[PDB]
Scaffold this active site. Structure first.
Site, PDB file in Angstrom:
ATOM      1  N   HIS A 156       0.875  -1.171   0.000  1.00  0.00           N
ATOM      2  CA  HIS A 156       0.000   0.000   0.000  1.00  0.00           C
ATOM      3  C   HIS A 156       0.911   1.220   0.000  1.00  0.00           C
ATOM      4  CE1 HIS A 156       0.334  -0.325   4.487  1.00  0.00           C
ATOM      5  NE2 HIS A 156       0.147   0.984   4.466  1.00  0.00           N
ATOM      6  N   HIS A 212       1.720   3.844   2.011  1.00  0.00           N
ATOM      7  CA  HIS A 212       2.346   4.541   3.128  1.00  0.00           C
ATOM      8  C   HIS A 212       3.862   4.410   3.091  1.00  0.00           C
ATOM      9  CE1 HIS A 212      -1.421   4.443   5.925  1.00  0.00           C
ATOM     10  NE2 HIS A 212      -1.448   5.447   5.067  1.00  0.00           N
ATOM     11  N   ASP A 233       5.914   3.153   5.153  1.00  0.00           N
ATOM     12  CA  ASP A 233       6.523   1.884   5.547  1.00  0.00           C
ATOM     13  C   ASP A 233       6.497   0.856   4.431  1.00  0.00           C
ATOM     14  OD1 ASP A 233       3.754   1.497   5.742  1.00  0.00           O
ATOM     15  OD2 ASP A 233       3.829   0.367   7.607  1.00  0.00           O
ATOM     16  N   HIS A 237      -6.981  -1.588   5.995  1.00  0.00           N
ATOM     17  CA  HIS A 237      -6.040  -0.626   6.567  1.00  0.00           C
ATOM     18  C   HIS A 237      -5.962   0.631   5.706  1.00  0.00           C
ATOM     19  CE1 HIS A 237      -2.312   0.996   8.295  1.00  0.00           C
ATOM     20  NE2 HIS A 237      -1.887   1.115   7.047  1.00  0.00           N
ATOM     21  N   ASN A 249      -2.690   2.988  13.491  1.00  0.00           N
ATOM     22  CA  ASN A 249      -2.859   4.088  12.529  1.00  0.00           C
ATOM     23  C   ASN A 249      -3.986   3.752  11.567  1.00  0.00           C
ATOM     24  OD1 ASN A 249      -2.606   6.446  11.060  1.00  0.00           O
ATOM     25  ND2 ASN A 249      -0.860   5.722   9.838  1.00  0.00           N
TER      26      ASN A 249
HETATM   27  N1  LIG Z   1       3.990   9.651   4.027  1.00  0.00           N
HETATM   28  C1  LIG Z   1       3.026   8.965   4.895  1.00  0.00           C
HETATM   29  C2  LIG Z   1       1.744   9.493   5.029  1.00  0.00           C
HETATM   30  C3  LIG Z   1       0.807   8.883   5.870  1.00  0.00           C
HETATM   31  C4  LIG Z   1       1.142   7.735   6.600  1.00  0.00           C
HETATM   32  C5  LIG Z   1       2.421   7.198   6.475  1.00  0.00           C
HETATM   33  C6  LIG Z   1       2.828   5.952   7.265  1.00  0.00           C
HETATM   34  C7  LIG Z   1       2.228   5.499   8.494  1.00  0.00           C
HETATM   35  N2  LIG Z   1       2.879   4.391   8.851  1.00  0.00           N
HETATM   36  C8  LIG Z   1       2.625   3.569  10.023  1.00  0.00           C
HETATM   37  C9  LIG Z   1       3.356   3.771  11.177  1.00  0.00           C
HETATM   38  C10 LIG Z   1       3.111   2.974  12.280  1.00  0.00           C
HETATM   39  C11 LIG Z   1       2.144   1.978  12.221  1.00  0.00           C
HETATM   40  C12 LIG Z   1       1.389   1.768  11.072  1.00  0.00           C
HETATM   41  C13 LIG Z   1       0.317   0.660  11.050  1.00  0.00           C
HETATM   42  O1  LIG Z   1       0.192  -0.106  10.056  1.00  0.00           O
HETATM   43  O2  LIG Z   1      -0.454   0.476  12.034  1.00  0.00           O
HETATM   44  C14 LIG Z   1       1.661   2.570   9.970  1.00  0.00           C
HETATM   45  C15 LIG Z   1       0.888   2.434   8.672  1.00  0.00           C
HETATM   46  O3  LIG Z   1       1.255   1.652   7.750  1.00  0.00           O
HETATM   47  O4  LIG Z   1      -0.121   3.169   8.540  1.00  0.00           O
HETATM   48  N3  LIG Z   1       3.812   4.148   7.937  1.00  0.00           N
HETATM   49  N4  LIG Z   1       3.798   5.060   6.982  1.00  0.00           N
HETATM   50  C16 LIG Z   1       3.346   7.807   5.635  1.00  0.00           C
HETATM   51 ZN   LIG Z   2       2.069  -0.310   8.397  1.00  0.00          ZN
HETATM   52 ZN   LIG Z   3      -0.129   1.852   6.332  1.00  0.00          ZN
END
Ligand SMILES: Nc1cccc(-c2cn(-c3cccc(C(=O)O)c3C(=O)O)nn2)c1
Ligand SMILES: [Zn+2]
Ligand SMILES: [Zn+2]
Length: 231
Positions: free
Chosen positions: A83, A85, A87, A148, A179
């Site tokens: 996806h 984001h 990560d 998600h 999140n």
């Molecule tokens: N550039 C951007 C914008 C919005 C969200 C993100 C993001 C959020 N992340 C998360 C950090 C901690 C936990 C989770 C989770 O899966 O619960 C995530 C996530 O993938 O949303 N990873 N990347 C980056």
């Molecule tokens: Zn994640």
């Molecule tokens: Zn995510």
């Protein structure tokens, strides 16, 4: 034993071998004031490697490529982001410059673009509708529906019975949502049901964050998501 968040310094990457030709990669990243662990997958593809998701950031992903060369030696030639984001796509420029062909669905690439995130180079066709699956070398890619995020994909390795659920699946210890700013809470249980109908013999289920387990991660994730809904 599977590495946990407090055991991995930000900037380091662990590999965990799940079966013959299947590993997960584990890294850590600070996000919103805290350090989280994050999982991806590596699947052997003959004399090549298929990578699922970055290691969350250009630096972690450079170290991922280094750990793969040190511990496996086969070349990463294709990567899929599950996806949009950070990560999952954070570090895609490093993969590309290193000669990795980077893929994602059109929705993921579009949402990554809107978001200002690095953008995988190639669109994956055939994943536009809930319940769609496509073959991608040694794995099947599945779009279970919105969860998600609206674009999230899951990855199944049929020869190994390994289901990579990505961030649509929670680890068993997780008792609150996390999140969900981009989630579809109403759709999420239904999407998980599609995963369960499709991969009921999965022997190893990998969440986006934290410890792998069995098929019970699926039902458990539904429970946590609903509970977050009802309050
Ligand atoms: N550039 C951007 C914008 C919005 C969200 C993100 C993001 C959020 N992340 C998360 C950090 C901690 C936990 C989770 C989770 O899966 O619960 C995530 C996530 O993938 O949303 N990873 N990347 C980056
Ligand atoms: Zn994640
Ligand atoms: Zn995510």
């Amino acid at each position: 034993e599977y590495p946990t968040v407090s055991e991995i310094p930000v900037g380091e990457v662990r590999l965990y071998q799940i079966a013959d030709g299947v590993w997960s990669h584990i890294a850590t990243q600070s996000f919103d004031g805290a350090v989280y662990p994050s999982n991806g997958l590596i699947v052997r593809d003959g004399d090549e490697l298929l990578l699922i998701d970055t290691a969350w950031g250009a630096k972690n992903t450079a170290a991922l490529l280094a750990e793969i060369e040190k511990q496996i030696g086969l070349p990463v030639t294709r990567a899929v982001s599950t996806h949009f984001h950070d990560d999952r796509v954070g570090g895609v420029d490093v993969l590309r410059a290193a000669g990795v062909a980077t893929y994602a669905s059109p929705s993921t690439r579009r949402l990554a673009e809107v978001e200002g995130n690095e953008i995988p180079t190639h669109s994956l066709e055939g994943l536009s509708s809930s319940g769609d699956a496509v073959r991608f070398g040694p794995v099947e890619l599945f779009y279970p529906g919105a969860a998600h995020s609206t674009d999230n994909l899951v990855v199944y390795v049929p020869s190994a019975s390994v289901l990579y659920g990505g961030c649509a699946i929670y680890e068993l210890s997780r008792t609150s949502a996390g999140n969900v700013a981009d989630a579809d809470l109403a759709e999420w249980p239904t999407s998980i049901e599609r995963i369960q109908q499709h991969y009921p013999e999965a022997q190893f289920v990998i969440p986006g964050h934290g410890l792998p387990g069995g098929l019970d991660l699926l039902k458990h994730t539904t429970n946590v998501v609903k509970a977050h809904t009802n309050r």
